[PDB]
Design a protein around this ligand. Structure first.
Ligand SMILES: [Zn+2]
Length: 56
RNA sequence: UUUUGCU
């Protein structure tokens, strides 16, 4: 696959209180057990790799 | 809406 870093302006690095984000919690839905990267509410699947919807 | 969490 292709992967290239374009340009940047304001670097990222969010870190300032997270309620109680547990090491075994989700920072997406707020679920306990799965990770955000494993959140079943992620813009992935079942078919159609394209986040950020356009039409309602 | 929420990935603000090292492989
Ligand atoms: Zn989740």
């Amino acid at each position: 696959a292709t992967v290239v870093s374009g340009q940047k302006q304001d670097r990222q690095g969010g870190e300032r209180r997270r309620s109680q984000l547990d090491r075994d919690q989700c920072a997406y839905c707020k679920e306990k057990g799965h990770w955000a990267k494993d959140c079943p509410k992620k813009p992935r699947g079942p078919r159609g790799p394209r986040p950020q919807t356009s039409l309602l």
